[PDB]
Amino acid sequence: ARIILTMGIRSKASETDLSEILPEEIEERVKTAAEVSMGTEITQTDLDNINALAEQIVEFAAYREQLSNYLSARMKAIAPNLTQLVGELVGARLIAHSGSLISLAKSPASTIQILGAEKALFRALKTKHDTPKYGLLYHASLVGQATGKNKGKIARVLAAKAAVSLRYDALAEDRDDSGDIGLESRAKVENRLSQLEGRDLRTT
Amino acid sequence: PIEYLLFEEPTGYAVFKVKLQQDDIGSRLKEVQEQINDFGAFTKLIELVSFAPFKGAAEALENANDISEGLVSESLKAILDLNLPKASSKKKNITLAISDKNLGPSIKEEFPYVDCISNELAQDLIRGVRLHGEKLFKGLQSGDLERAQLGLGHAYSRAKVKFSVQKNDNHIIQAIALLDQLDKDINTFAMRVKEWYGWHFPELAKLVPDNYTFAKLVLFIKDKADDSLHDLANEDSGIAQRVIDNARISSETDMENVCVFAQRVASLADYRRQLYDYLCEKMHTVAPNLSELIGEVIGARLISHAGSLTNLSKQAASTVQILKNKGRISRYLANKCSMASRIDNYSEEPSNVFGSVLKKQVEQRLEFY
Amino acid sequence: QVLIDTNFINFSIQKKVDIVRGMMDCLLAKCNPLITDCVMAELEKLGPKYRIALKLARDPRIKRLSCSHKGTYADDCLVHRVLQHKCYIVATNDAGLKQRIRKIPGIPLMSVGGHAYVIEKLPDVF
Amino acid sequence: TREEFVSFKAHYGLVTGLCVTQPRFHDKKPDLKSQNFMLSCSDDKTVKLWSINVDDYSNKNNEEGLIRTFDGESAFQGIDSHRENSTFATGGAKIHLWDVNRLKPVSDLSWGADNITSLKFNQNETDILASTGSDNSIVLYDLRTNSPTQKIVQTMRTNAICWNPMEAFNFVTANEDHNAYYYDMRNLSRSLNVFKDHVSAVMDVDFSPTGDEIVTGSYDKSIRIYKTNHGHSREIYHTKRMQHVFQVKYSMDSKYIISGSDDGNVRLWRSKAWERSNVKTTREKN
Amino acid sequence: DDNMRREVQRDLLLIKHRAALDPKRHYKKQRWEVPERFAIGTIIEDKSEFYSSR
Amino acid sequence: NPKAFPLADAALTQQILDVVQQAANLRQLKKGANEATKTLNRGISEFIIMAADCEPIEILLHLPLLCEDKNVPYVFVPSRVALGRACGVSRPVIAASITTNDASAIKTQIYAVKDKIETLL
Amino acid sequence: GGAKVVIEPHRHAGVYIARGKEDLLVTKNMAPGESVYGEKRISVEEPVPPTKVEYRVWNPFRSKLAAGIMGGLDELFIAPGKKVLYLGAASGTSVSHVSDVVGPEGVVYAVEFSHRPGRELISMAKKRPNIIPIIEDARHPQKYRMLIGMVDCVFADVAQPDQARIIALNSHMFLKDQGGVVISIKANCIDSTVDAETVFAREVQKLREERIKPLEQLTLEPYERDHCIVVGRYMRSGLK
RNA sequence: GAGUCCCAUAACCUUUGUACCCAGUGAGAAA
RNA sequence: GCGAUGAUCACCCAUGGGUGGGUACAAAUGGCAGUCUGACAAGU
RNA sequence: AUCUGUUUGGUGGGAAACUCAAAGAGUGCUAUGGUAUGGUGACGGAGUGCGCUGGUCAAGAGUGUAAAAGCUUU
Numbered sequence A: 001a002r003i004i005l006t007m008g009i010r011s012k013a014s015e016t017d018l019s020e021i022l023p024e025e026i027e028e029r030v031k032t033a034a035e036v037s038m039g040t041e042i043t044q045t046d047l048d049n050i051n052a053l054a055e056q057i058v059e060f061a062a063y064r065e066q067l068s069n070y071l072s073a074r075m076k077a078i079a080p081n082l083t084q085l086v087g088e089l090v091g092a093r094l095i096a097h098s099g100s101l102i103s104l105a106k107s108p109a110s111t112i113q114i115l116g117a118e119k120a121l122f123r124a125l126k127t128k129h130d131t132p133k134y135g136l137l138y139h140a141s142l143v144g145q146a147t148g149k150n151k152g153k154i155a156r157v158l159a160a161k162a163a164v165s166l167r168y169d170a171l172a173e174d175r176d177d178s179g180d181i182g183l184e185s186r187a188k189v190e191n192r193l194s195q196l197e198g199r200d201l202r203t204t
Numbered sequence B: 001p002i003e004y005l006l007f008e009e010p011t012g013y014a015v016f017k018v019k020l021q022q023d024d025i026g027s028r029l030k031e032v033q034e035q036i037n038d039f040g041a042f043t044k045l046i047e048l049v050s051f052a053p054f055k056g057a058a059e060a061l062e063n064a065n066d067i068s069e070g071l072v073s074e075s076l077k078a079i080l081d082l083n084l085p086k087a088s089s090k091k092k093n094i095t096l097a098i099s100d101k102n103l104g105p106s107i108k109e110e111f112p113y114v115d116c117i118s119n120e121l122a123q124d125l126i127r128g129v130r131l132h133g134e135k136l137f138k139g140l141q142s143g144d145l146e147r148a149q150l151g152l153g154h155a156y157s158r159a160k161v162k163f164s165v166q167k168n169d170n171h172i173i174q175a176i177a178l179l180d181q182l183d184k185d186i187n188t189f190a191m192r193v194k195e196w197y198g199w200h201f202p203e204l205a206k207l208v209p210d211n212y213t214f215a216k217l218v219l220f221i222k223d224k225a226d227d228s229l230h231d232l233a234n235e236d237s238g239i240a241q242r243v244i245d246n247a248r249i250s251s252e253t254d255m256e257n258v259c260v261f262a263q264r265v266a267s268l269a270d271y272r273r274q275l276y277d278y279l280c281e282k283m284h285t286v287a288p289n290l291s292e293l294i295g296e297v298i299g300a301r302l303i304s305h306a307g308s309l310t311n312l313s314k315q316a317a318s319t320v321q322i323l324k325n326k327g328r329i330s331r332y333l334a335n336k337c338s339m340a341s342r343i344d345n346y347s348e349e350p351s352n353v354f355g356s357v358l359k360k361q362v363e364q365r366l367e368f369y
Numbered sequence C: 001q002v003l004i005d006t007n008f009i010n011f012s013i014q015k016k017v018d019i020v021r022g023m024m025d026c027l028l029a030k031c032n033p034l035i036t037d038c039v040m041a042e043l044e045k046l047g048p049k050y051r052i053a054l055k056l057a058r059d060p061r062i063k064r065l066s067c068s069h070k071g072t073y074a075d076d077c078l079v080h081r082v083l084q085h086k087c088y089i090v091a092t093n094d095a096g097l098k099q100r101i102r103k104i105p106g107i108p109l110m111s112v113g114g115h116a117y118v119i120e121k122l123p124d125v126f
Numbered sequence D: 001t002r003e004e005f006v007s008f009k010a011h012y013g014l015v016t017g018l019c020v021t022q023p024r025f026h027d028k029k030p031d032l033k034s035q036n037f038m039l040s041c042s043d044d045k046t047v048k049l050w051s052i053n054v055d056d057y058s059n060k061n062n063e064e065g066l067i068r069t070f071d072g073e074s075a076f077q078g079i080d081s082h083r084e085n086s087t088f089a090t091g092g093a094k095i096h097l098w099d100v101n102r103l104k105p106v107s108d109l110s111w112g113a114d115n116i117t118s119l120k121f122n123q124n125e126t127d128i129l130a131s132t133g134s135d136n137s138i139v140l141y142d143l144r145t146n147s148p149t150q151k152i153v154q155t156m157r158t159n160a161i162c163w164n165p166m167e168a169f170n171f172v173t174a175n176e177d178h179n180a181y182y183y184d185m186r187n188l189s190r191s192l193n194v195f196k197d198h199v200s201a202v203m204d205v206d207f208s209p210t211g212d213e214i215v216t217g218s219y220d221k222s223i224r225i226y227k228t229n230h231g232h233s234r235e236i237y238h239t240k241r242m243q244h245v246f247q248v249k250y251s252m253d254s255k256y257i258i259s260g261s262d263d264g265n266v267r268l269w270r271s272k273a274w275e276r277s278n279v280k281t282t283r284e285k286n
Numbered sequence E: 001d002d003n004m005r006r007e008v009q010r011d012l013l014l015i016k017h018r019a020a021l022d023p024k025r026h027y028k029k030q031r032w033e034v035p036e037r038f039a040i041g042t043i044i045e046d047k048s049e050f051y052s053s054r
Numbered sequence F: 001n002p003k004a005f006p007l008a009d010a011a012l013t014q015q016i017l018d019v020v021q022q023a024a025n026l027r028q029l030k031k032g033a034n035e036a037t038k039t040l041n042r043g044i045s046e047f048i049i050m051a052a053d054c055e056p057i058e059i060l061l062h063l064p065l066l067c068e069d070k071n072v073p074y075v076f077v078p079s080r081v082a083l084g085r086a087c088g089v090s091r092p093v094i095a096a097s098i099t100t101n102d103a104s105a106i107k108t109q110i111y112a113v114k115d116k117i118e119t120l121l
Numbered sequence G: 001g002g003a004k005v006v007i008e009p010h011r012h013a014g015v016y017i018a019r020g021k022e023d024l025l026v027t028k029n030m031a032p033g034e035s036v037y038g039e040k041r042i043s044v045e046e047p048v049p050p051t052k053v054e055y056r057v058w059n060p061f062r063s064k065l066a067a068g069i070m071g072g073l074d075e076l077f078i079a080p081g082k083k084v085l086y087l088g089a090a091s092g093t094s095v096s097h098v099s100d101v102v103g104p105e106g107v108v109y110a111v112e113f114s115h116r117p118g119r120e121l122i123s124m125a126k127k128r129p130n131i132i133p134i135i136e137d138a139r140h141p142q143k144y145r146m147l148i149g150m151v152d153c154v155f156a157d158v159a160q161p162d163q164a165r166i167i168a169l170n171s172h173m174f175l176k177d178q179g180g181v182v183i184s185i186k187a188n189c190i191d192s193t194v195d196a197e198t199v200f201a202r203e204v205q206k207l208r209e210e211r212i213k214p215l216e217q218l219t220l221e222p223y224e225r226d227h228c229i230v231v232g233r234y235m236r237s238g239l240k
Numbered sequence H: 001g002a003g004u005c006c007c008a009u010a011a012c013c014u015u016u017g018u019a020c021c022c023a024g025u026g027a028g029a030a031a
Numbered sequence I: 001g002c003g004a005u006g007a008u009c010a011c012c013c014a015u016g017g018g019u020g021g022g023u024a025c026a027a028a029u030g031g032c033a034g035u036c037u038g039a040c041a042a043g044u
Numbered sequence J: 001a002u003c004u005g006u007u008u009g010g011u012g013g014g015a016a017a018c019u020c021a022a023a024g025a026g027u028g029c030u031a032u033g034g035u036a037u038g039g040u041g042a043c044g045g046a047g048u049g050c051g052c053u054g055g056u057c058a059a060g061a062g063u064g065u066a067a068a069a070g071c072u073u074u
C-alpha cells in the first residue's frame, strides 16, 4: 500500500525511487518489472480509488498497532506479572479464554499448561491416548527458546510459574504494578531453561 | 551463398554473419538436420556481428507491428545500413537471409543491392538461432528474452484487439465485492463502538441509530457538553442534551481508545460512498443501459453474481437471477435486462438510449397491471 | 481406394485386365488405386524382366502413397496401414497376404480371378 | 527437397537433349532471380525454350512454359548452350549453331555429311565446341573461325564428352569399347589417360567441378568414379533397382553425383561414400 | 500420515468397494489399492446454478 | 467489417430460408434468441441464423461468441421479417437454430446449407 | 454438489482423478477462487496453517483434450514444466486446463484469430499469468514469430481444412526436435464428402509428409462423433 | 512422563430475534 | 388498438388477518462439554 | 446371557555416509582455427602508383521505329 501511494504508475516508478519502503534489494526487481510487464495502464479515476484503498489499509494497520499498544497498557496495568512472564497478548488470550482473571487464577497450573488445546485434550482422554503438552502457552517466547522435548518440559515449568504470578496478580491487594513477582519467576524459568539446554543426550 | 542473417526478436534486431554454408543438396539428411540442434556445430555456421536493442516497450510494440505486417521500420533501416556492405544493384547483390517472404520486398524497396532469401535453408538457419537464442548473443543484451516476450505478446494482443481499460468490468466486480466486505466491516466496527459507549450512556444508540451519525457525534462529545448548537448534524439533539443532563451510565485511556475506534469507523464510512460514487460512475461508463434499466448498484451486483459483463451477456434470458403479476414482472425485467446487457457488452462505446427505451417498456408493462 | 501389390499387377497383365477399368467394372464404382513406395520398390527390384509391369504401374491414373519405414516389405506395410485405418480395399493375390487381410475384420479384398477382378469382403457389390 | 518445381509435356518423341540457359535477349531483360530457363531438343524436329518459376529469392511479389520454339527440318540429337552470348548448338542430322533471338540457325558447322550424336561446349575458353559423330568420330569446332577445327576417328563410337572445368583444353570421352579416354585438345594423337574398369559400353561421363575426378556411368547397370591421374575406378556404385545408367552428372558441390537410369529414376549419390555432410568441429575435422 | 489415514480409512474402503454400494451402478473392473499420495477434497458447487446438484 | 459480418447474399438467403421453413414444419427449428442460446449451450444445434437488421444488433451478436466457442456455423440473413415468415410464426424472429436430428427427413438439405455457410464463414 | 472426493494423481503428470461414486478428471487451479466456464471445483485443505488449494473438473464433452485423456492416450506431451502452443484457442475453455496442467513454471501461447474470444482470452490470462494470448491468424506464423520462441508441444484445435499446413508451419517455426504434436481432427469440418477414416488417413499421411511421425491415434467416440486425436512427435530427421 | 501451532481464536445442534418462500417451458393471449 | 425483441404454465374466513415447515444474518453464563500426570531428574 | 454362530477385520534382508570404488542415462557451459596474430629488419608504419567497389553523366553498340521514345550492353 505504501509503495503504490508513493509511485502510482510504472513510468512514475521509472522516474522515482524509494528507500523507506522495500529495503535496498527489491528495488532492481521492481524496476525491471516496471520496465517489462504484462500489465496494462490504469486511468486517474480508478487510480484514485486504488490510492484511497491503499491509505485505508495503511491507516488500518496504524489502528492495529495502536490497539496493540492499548492491549499492552491495560494488560500491564491489570495482570502485570503475567506480562513479565509470558507476555502481553499471550496472557491476554489466556484471560480471555478462561473468562475472568480470578477464574483463571483459581485454576491449577496443569490447566494453564493445556489451556488452549481442549479438543485434542478431551479426544485424547475419551480415547486412551496421549494428551497434548502445549496448549495456548506454546507461543510464549521461552517455549520458543526451547527446542525438543524440553519445550514440553518448560511449558510445564512456565505454566507453574505463570499460575504463581497470575494468582498473585488476581489475589493481591498490596500489589504495585511493577513486575517483581513475574520478574523473579521469569528468572527462575530462564535459568531452568539454561540448565536443561546445557545438557546434551550425546556422549562426548 | 546466404551471407548475412537477420533475426528479429523482442529485445531488438540482430544481424548475424554466416561463416560456413550448410549443405543445399544434403539439407534433408539426418546429420544436417541435427547439426542445428547441436550447439557445438551451429556456432561453426553462425556468428553475431550486430545487435541493436530497442528503446523500450513502445518501440518494441512499434517494431512488432511493423515486422508483423511486413514493413521495414526505421531501426531496421539503421541496422541494415550499418551492417550490410554497399554491394551492386545489378551484379552480385549482398544476400540477406530473412524468415518472411513478404518482408523481403520491403527490404529491397529500401536497399536495392540486397536480395533476400527465405527458403528452407534460411528457415532452418533462423530456427537454429531461435533454438539457441541467449547463447549466441554472448551476453550483450539487457533484459531476459522470455520476459520481454511475455510483455511484447501481451502488448501486441491488447493492441490488436483494442483492449480498453475504461470498459473493464473487473473494476466493478472488485468494487462491489469490496463494498460488501466493508458493509459488514463498518457494521461490526460501529456495533463494537456502540457497545463500548453503551456504558457512557445507553441512549445515543436509541436516539441516533445510524452508525456513521452516532460515530461522528461521539467523536466530539466525550463529556457533558449545554451549547447544543453544532450537534444537529434539532429535536434529537435537544433530547440528547437532555439525556446528557440525565446521564445514567459510567475513563481516560479507554475513552481515548474508543475515540480512535470511532475515528476508524468514520474513515471507513467516508471511504464507503466514495467507493459507491466511483462504482456508479464506472457503471455508467461500463454498463449504461443496465444502470438506466435497474440502477447502478443493482446492475453491479448482477454482473458480479454473473461473474462478468460477458457472462451476463451470453447467459440466456430465462436464466437471469434479478433481485402472479409480481411474479412475471420479474421475468419481463429479466429478459429486458438480459437484452440490455447484451447491447451494453457488445457495443463498443455504448449510449444510454436503449436502456431508456427498455426502461420505458418495463414501466409501460408494470403500469398496465 | 484400393492398395495394389506386385502379384496383383503381374496377374493383371497376365490376364489382360486394365487396372482402373478392371476395378471400375468389378466394384461398379469409381476407384482410386494406390501404389505404395514399397510395392514400387518391389516392382523395381523384380528386374528387367518386369519392365512392362513397372511402366504400367507408372501411370498417372494410379495415385501413389509414401510409406515411411525401412525395408521394402510390402505385405507388412499393407497390413499395417490397413489395420490402422480400415478405409482401404486390398487388391492382392498372395496366399499369405490374402489370409492376413481376410483375417483382419472389415477389410475388403480384391483379387484377379479368371478374366476379371473379384471382390469378397465388400458387402455392397450389386 | 527432392521434388519437382514443374513438369512439362515437352515433346512427342524422345527428348534427346536438354540444357539450361541465361537467355541474353536484347529486347527483354532476363529475370534470373525468379525464372530459370531450360531448353530442349527432340526428334520431332523441335528445340523449345522454357521458363520456370523458382522460389530461391523472396524479392518479388507468371507465364512459365514455352517462351519460344525453334524449328529444324530434320531431327536433333544433342544440345548444349554456350556459357555466354545467347548461343547454343544442336547436333542431329547436322550440327547447327543458334541464338535465342533468331528463329533459324546462324551457321551450319558440319565436317561432312555424317550425322552428329553428341555435343559439349567448353566451360572456359567458352567458344570451343566438341561433338561425337556416329562414324566413330570426335570433332572439335571453334567459334572464332566459325568452323570445325580437327577431328579424329577412333575404333568405336564416342557416346559422350565432358571438358575439364579446371584445365580448359583437356576433355574426356566416354565410348563404346568399355573405357574412357582423357584427351588433350592440342594433341589428339594420344590419349593422356584411359579409364578402363567398365565392362559394357560407357554411356556418360562428367567431371568434378574441382577437375580432379570423373564419374562415368555405363551400360552395365553401374556407375564408376575415377581419379583423373590413375586410370582405374576409385569407386563403383550399383543397385538392383538401377538399370542401364544413361546419364550421369557431378553436382556443382563436387560432393554428390546425379545418375539417371532407364527404369525412370534419378538418384543422388555421395561422391565420397564414407563422407557425411554435416559441419564438423575442429576435433573431428582434424 | 497414518494419523490421517486412520481418519479417512473408512471412505477409502467405500471407494475400494464402490461396486457393491448401489445394485444398479456396475463400475468397470479395476482394483484400486490405496494410493501413496492422495488428498480428501470437497466439491464446491458454485453460486451460479441452483437446485439441481445442490 | 461490420458487427453482423458473415451476411449471405440473395441466393444463399433463399436457400437458408427454404430449409428453415422445412425444419419448422418438421419440428427441428428452435426460434428466437434465448431459445437459440439455450439449444446452443445444450449442443443440439446444427447452424444458427441471425437477422442483421433488428433494432439493436448486439441483442443477437451475443450468439456468434457462443457459436465460435462450440464450433457451430452462424449466418446473417438480412431480413427479420422474412426470417419470421419462413419460421412460420406470425411475428418477426431475430434468431433461429436448426436442432440436430438423425431421424430427420431433410438432413441432406441441412448439410448442404451448412457446407455453403461454412465456406462463406 | 457438496460431497467429498479423494484426489489421486493420474498416470499423466499434472492431472488428477477425483474418486467418489463417479470419478472426475481434475486439474489443479492456477487462479483459485473462481470458475472460468462454470465447471465445478474441489477444494482441498492441504497442510503456518494449512492452505485451501482447489481443483477444477475437466469436462470431456467440452474439451477434446480431456476426451482424449479419459479415452486413454499413451503419451500426452503437455507436461508440468513445458511450453505448449495452443492453436485455435477458441475461448478460454481448454486453454485454462492446459495452462494449469502446464503449471506456473511453464508457458501456454494461446493463438486465436477472432476478437471477442481474444478479449475473453486476455481477461483470463490476467488471472492465469502463464498464458500468452496471441491474437493472430495461425495460417501466417511469421506475423507472430517475434512473440513466441521454441515451444515443446503444439496442440491444434483448429477446425479448418488447411489444418495440416497450419500445423506444419507452426511446427517448423516454433517446435523443437522430438517435441509433441497433438492434433484434434474433426472429419466433418475437414470435408464431408468422404468418410471419417479416409480423412483421418489423409491427415496422418499429410503429417508424415510434413515429417511429423504419428505415434498414436484415438477416436474419442463417446464424447464426439467422428473426431480424432492424433499424437505425433516432430522427428525432423528420419521418420524411418 | 505426555498428539495442540492442523482453526475451543473452532465446528455442529438447539433456542431467540430480523427479511423472504411453502425455475424451466416454448405459441399462445384477448373476445 | 398483443406476442419469439417471448404468450403461457401449507391449514382457516364474509385487497386484510390467524397457525406453522426452510432460507440467511446475529445472539446465548443454551447444549455437546468433561480442563493432563504427580516425585524424581541431571552431574561427579 | 455357564445364548448363539455366521459375517467383517486383525493374528497365524535392514540401517547409516563430508565412506570407497564400478558403470548407465539425462542436463548444463561459447562448446566457436574451413585451413589460426598485422609483422622470423626476410619486418612494420607513412606516402605514391597500379588494382578494386558504388552511383552519376557522356560516348559506343544492339534491338525497335516514319522518326522516335523505350529497353538491353562482361
Ligand SMILES: [Zn+2]
Pocket: C036, C037, C038, C039, C067, C068, C073, C074, C077, C078
Ligand atoms: Zn511401404
